[PDB]
Subunit: 1011 residues, 3 copies
């Protein structure tokens, strides 16, 4: 026998419910991954279900024996498999087969056999739970002894209802592996045919916890929030002040005589212990109903101002005695507060509160002239005046308010007198005086411990305090009403209650496809604290990343483990916080670096130094904007009530909630329609692109529609479309079909490329594209001569620029991130809404039809109401989230409409609004629930450092360029436009005179020639 | 502008009308609940209405 | 900017102060409710606080 690792074994079918092609997260008893497995006639203890994998060829393993003693005293399970049928018996046997036709079953005993049953790499999960021995058998007869580290689910062979206790078990002979199960959480991937092809644990590795969190087997590169770490309490102290043992109850409860219901005694108890178990059997009183504070918990923080009330009543009188009750007893004998936090004890008292002939002394206040209030006693016994005239005795309705009770021992059970003790105590006053005994402990000394200070219970770190408690204050809180200081009278030392350290943990992963290594960030914690918690086995996320050297880093965000800090600087890849970012580098590992804010570039400013570009670039940049959202209509009745009139009637009493939700959803839908209307339908007439499509070298094929395909979309539109992507919820189709939206886009683009921007200001005015582009250069401070002088090149500069766009949308799969995020957000909202239909919301069941066919309608009303409230809050949350998302998408659609008005129907002078550079033109392209703008921008390049001067002094007067800039290449001076180096000989045509040569700071002598 | 005014008016009208919704309780008026039942169960009914 | 900071602080302060709201239950602390009532009855109070 040795020790091996259970690689991926032990996965069985948790239930007999079919599921196909899903990723179901289930918590159950399993064999944890990579657990330690014993590979072997010892008596193996039965740790709540075992995984027994027998590998054999001689059929030596003839079965199993289970039990607690296995010695013919307690019931033991015998399983044997002889040659064809599995004999399963539940008997009480001393021994078994342990000492072809070489062996036979003789055993040693067969007493009280309560149950009988008959039917390589033999895997058997034996699970004892709920009176069931569940045997999950996988007999995959592998041909060969190679033990495969592979996957194989265990179908449930049998579920025997034997219902016996099993703590130990052995194997029966005529090798094998044993592993022990623990309660874990698994993600099972049920395949089409209904088979669990794979399972993922949720407690090994940070990676196989984010796999569970996202409910997927492949996570993407990124920081993932997950469960919250917390240092678990180390010890558990229970400190009280100096205590005394009196328990002055039984000597009172046993007493010969108590008082009447009107003459009751408020007995006060102080400075003792709550020895209340004696009242159950030592004074065996039967009626014990504790209201407000259920019994069997009466051992600490129990009583502060405990009072006892002694009542003597009949048998059929305790019923009227309850908090909030009314009646003559309540009216004039005694009245209870509604918030009675105490206990009522009643018991028959014939032999101790009655006379053998009958004791006519225990009377009651029949009438009284004072209304009773909580915790008040009736004393006055004068004649109850019932008339306006002074009423004394007979005459008016008045009578003596004291009637004798005939407490006879010959009366029936209903008339037998009851002695009653009412323990009324207030679990509030901070100073206490009575509860039971418990072990005390010294100061925790800076240790996260369960504290029980005088009833104040919690988990925290108790340290010396400098807060001056005046010698009457017991507790000490903060503005948040959190107790930040306590002092036990026994120690009389003021100590603060700073809580046990916690926060969250977040997993940095480079993606499952890339690698499997991960890093963990304990947010907001000192690395010393987390290392100490690691050492003394105190961190809740039991998976421990090995804290080797050069792998624990302390950032302002917290403690990062699993990645080394590098003093080099890089652009952020996986944001962490405080300016640190982690990434996978190359041997290959996760590193954390200070984020580098781009390169550092020192501009060479000088008194006279200017740089004018000598060349440029026609960049084309894609800008994606959501425009719409999936119009969803939810039927309130069907969602809340599954076509049940019984539920509909209850829903009808909740006001016009369904009407409000329907109104909000319809408003959202019409808003989506108006959004796409305003974004795409800004053109009055559908413009048709010309038959011949020569535009001075500008290609316009990937953006103009190509008729040789259905839906008449552009190839770029085709890539965009192919790249993106029940129970009362309906997805209403958009008013504008995708073909209509494509037609709007085609008309907009055709007007842009034929009539220029004129079609946005009125009638479309035809104009050749090489002239429109010259206008658009004039609109950015670049003279039109630049275009015609360099037309063809620019055309190619545009054409290649558009070509890469295809690859930018083809090679990169996350280009349409925003639109896919919108779609995924809507899908997640709908998925959560439908999944919460399966939530019980603290009711009997999540399905209405079960509750209908389970209970009478008056009782089913409560469950239906709880389900209605839960589902209605679900609907309200969904509708509010949809309204907020619709407002956000409305803002985005307003931005898109503004862009199409200014970036497409004209040229915008707003900087960095229609691209990154000097805007030239723009092109819209439809996309699922959005638009994509191909912002065409002029970007200067190929600089040239030059010498400049604000003014030229030719004829003793200053001279200034009319629109250009005075520059020089060392010797000659030229006036040139300030966005493209076009040197020109300085003359009065480009220069205007203003003033003389004594005011300009940096005027320069030169010649301004005459043309 | 008329739609804005109508939206505000409809919101206010819905708010006042929902004062008459029983919300799965005995009635929609606090005073009847108070002068119809004992204070303990009346507390639960008022809690539901609240 | 001070208004933004104060609004966030007020939101957090209200969120933590409503931890002391009884919400029509026995108390505002789960620990007392647990060690005062049996779990079947304490279920109602825990549900109300939740
Ligand atoms: C405009 O660009 C398109 C590319 O979309 C050019 O079409 C290419 O034409 C050549 C031959 O002329 C073919 O070899 C390519 O396969 C075509 N491209 C594609 C994607 O099929 C077109 O020639 C360009 N010019 C005009 C006037 O349309
Ligand atoms: C089962 O039997 C064992 C015998 O030692 C005992 O310790 C254990 O408490 C029993 N538990 C049950 C009844 O499941
Ligand atoms: C009184 O004390 C005796 C002692 O034997 C006990 O049997 C009896 O139950 C007690 N009765 C009460 C009411 O305390
Ligand atoms: C209460 O005091 C009265 C005084 O007469 C006495 O008769 C009665 O037995 C007492 N009841 C108790 C001890 O609760
Ligand atoms: C963490 O604890 C050590 C030792 O107490 C201390 O020196 C260090 O400053 C702490 N870290 C931070 C961020 O305060
Ligand atoms: C620019 O001229 C000022 C004149 O006061 C001088 O102080 C400064 O050094 C000059 N900058 C240069 C030469 O880079
Ligand atoms: C300008 O840059 C383009 C490419 O960006 C290049 O082909 C061309 O030769 C450069 N010079 C001129 C004068 O166009
Ligand atoms: C342009 O700036 C560089 C420094 O960045 C300088 O060396 C160079 O001389 C400048 N150009 C001219 C025309 O002097
Ligand atoms: C400056 O530009 C003029 C333009 O005519 C040219 O002749 C000259 O060679 C250039 N360089 C210098 C150093 O003047
Ligand atoms: C510019 O020229 C005028 C006349 O030729 C002269 O008086 C003045 O000093 C000159 N300035 C400089 C800076 O050379």
């Amino acid at each position: 026998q040795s020790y091996t690792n259970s690689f991926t074994r032990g996965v069985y079918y948790p239930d007999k419910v079919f599921r196909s092609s899903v990723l179901h997260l289930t918590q159950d008893l399993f064999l944890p991954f990579f657990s330690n497995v014993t590979w072997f006639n010892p008596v193996l203890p039965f740790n709540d279900g075992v995984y027994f994998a027998s590998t054999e060829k001689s059929n030596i393993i003839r079965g199993w024996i289970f039990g607690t003693t296995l010695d013919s005293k307690t019931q033991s399970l015998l399983i044997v498999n002889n040659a064809t049928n599995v004999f399963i018996k539940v008997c009480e046997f001393q021994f078994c087969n342990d000492p072809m036709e070489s062996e036979s079953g003789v055993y040693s005993s067969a007493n009280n056999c309560t149950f009988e049953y008959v039917s390589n790499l033999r895997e058997f999960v034996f699970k004892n739970i709920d009176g069931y021995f569940k045997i999950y058998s996988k007999h995959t007869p592998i041909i060969g002894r190679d033990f495969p580290q592979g996957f194989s689910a265990l179908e449930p062979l049998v579920d025997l209802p034997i219902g016996i206790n099993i703590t130990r078990f052995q194997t029966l002979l005529a090798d094998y592996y044993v592993g022990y199960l623990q309660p874990r959480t698994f993600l099972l991937k049920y395949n089409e045919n209904g088979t669990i092809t794979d399972a993922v644990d949720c407690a090994l590795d940070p990676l196989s916890e984010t796999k569970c969190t996202l409910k997927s087997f492949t996570v993407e590169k990124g920081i993932y929030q997950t469960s919250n770490f917390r240092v678990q309490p180390t010890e558990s102290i229970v400190r009280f002040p100096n205590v005394t043992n009196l328990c002055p109850f039984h000597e009172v409860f046993n007493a010969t005589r108590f008082a009447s219901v009107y003459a009751w005694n408020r007995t006060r108890i102080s400075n003792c212990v709550a020895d209340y178990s004696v009242l159950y059997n030592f004074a065996p009183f039967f009626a014990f109903k504790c209201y407000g504070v259920s019994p069997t918990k009466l051992n600490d923080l129990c009583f502060t101002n405990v009072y006892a009330d002694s009542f003597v009543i009949k048998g059929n009188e305790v019923s009227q005695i309850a908090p909030g009750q009314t009646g003559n007893i309540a009216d004039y004998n005694y009245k209870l507060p509604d918030d009675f936090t105490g206990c009522v004890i009643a018991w028959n008292s014939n032999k101790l509160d009655s006379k053998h002939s009958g004791n006519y002394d225990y009377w009651y206040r029949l009438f009284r002239k004072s209304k009773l209030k909580p915790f008040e006693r009736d004393i006055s016994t004068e004649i109850y005046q019932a008339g306006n005239k002074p009423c004394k005795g007979k005459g008016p309705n008045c009578y003596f308010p004291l009637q004798s009770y005939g407490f006879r021992p010959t009366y029936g059970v209903g008339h037998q007198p009851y002695r009653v003790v009412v323990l009324s105590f207030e679990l509030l006053h901070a100073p206490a005086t009575v509860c039971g005994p418990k072990k005390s402990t010294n100061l925790v000394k800076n240790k996260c411990v369960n504290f029980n200070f005088n009833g104040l219970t919690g988990t925290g770190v108790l340290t010396k305090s400098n807060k001056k408690f005046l010698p009457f204050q017991q507790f000490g809180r903060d503005i948040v009403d959190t107790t930040d200081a306590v002092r036990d009278p026994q120690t009389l030392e003021i100590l603060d209650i700073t809580p046990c350290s916690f926060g969250g943990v977040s997993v940095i992963t480079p993606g499952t496809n890339t690698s499997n290594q991960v890093a963990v960030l304990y947010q907001g914690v000192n690395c010393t604290e987390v290392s100490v918690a690691i050492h003394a086995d105190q961190l809740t996320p039991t998976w421990r990343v090995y804290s080797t050297g050069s792998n624990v880093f302390q950032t302002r965000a917290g403690c990062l483990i699993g990645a080394e800090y590098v003093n080099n600087s890089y652009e952020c890849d996986i944001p962490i916080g405080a300016g640190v970012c982690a990434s996978y580098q190359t041997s290959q590992s996760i590193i954390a670096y200070t984020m580098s804010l781009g390169a550092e570039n020192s501009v060479a400013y000088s008194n006279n130094s200017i740089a004018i570009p000598t060349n440029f670039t026609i960049s084309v940049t894609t800008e994606i904007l959501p425009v719409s959202m999936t119009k969803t209509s939810v039927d309130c009745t069907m969602y809340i009530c599954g076509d049940s009139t019984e539920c509909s009637n209850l829903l009808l009493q909740y006001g016009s909630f369904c009407t409000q939700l329907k109104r909000a959803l319809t408003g959202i839908a019409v808003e989506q329609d108006k959004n796409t209307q305003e974004v795409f339908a800004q053109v009055k007439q559908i413009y048709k692109t010309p038959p011949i499509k020569y535009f001075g070298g500008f290609n316009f094929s990937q953006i103009l529609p190509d008729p040789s395909k259905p839906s008449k979309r552009s190839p770029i539109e085709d890539l965009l479309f192919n790249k993106v992507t029940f129970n009362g919820l309906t997805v209403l189709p958009p008013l504008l079909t995708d073909e209509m939206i494509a037609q709007y886009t085609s008309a907009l683009l055709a007007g842009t490329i034929t009539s220029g921007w004129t079609f946005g200001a009125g009638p479309a005015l035809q104009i050749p594209f090489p002239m429109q582009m010259a206008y658009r250069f004039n609109g950015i401070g670049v003279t039109q001569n630049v275009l015609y002088e360099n037309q063809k090149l620019i055309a190619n500069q545009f054409n290649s620029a558009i070509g890469k766009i295809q690859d930018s949308l083809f090679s990169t799969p996350s280009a349409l991130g925003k639109l896919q995020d919108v779609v995924n957000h809507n899908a997640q909202a709908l998925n959560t809404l439908v999944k919460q239909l399966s939530s019980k919301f603290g009711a009997i069941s999540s399905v209405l039809n079960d509750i209908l066919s389970r209970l009478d309608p008056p009782e089913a009303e409560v469950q239906i109401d709880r389900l209605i409230t839960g589902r209605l809050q679900s609907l309200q949350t969904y509708v509010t989230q949809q309204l907020i998302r619709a407002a956000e998408i409305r803002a985005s659609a307003n931005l898109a409409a503004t862009k199409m008005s200014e970036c497409v129907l004209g040229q915008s002078k707003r900087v960095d609004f229609c691209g990154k550079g000097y805007h030239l033109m723009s092109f819209p392209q439809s996309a699922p629930h959005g638009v994509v703008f191909l912002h065409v921008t002029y970007v200067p390049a190929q600089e040239k450092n030059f010498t400049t001067a604000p003014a030229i002094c030719h004829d003793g007067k200053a001279h200034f360029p009319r629109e250009g800039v005075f520059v020089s290449n060392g010797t000659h001076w030229f006036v040139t436009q300030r966005n493209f180096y076009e040197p020109q000989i300085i003359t009065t045509d480009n220069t205007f005179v203003s003033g003389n040569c004594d005011v300009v700071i940096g005027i320069v002598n030169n010649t301004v020639y005459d043309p």
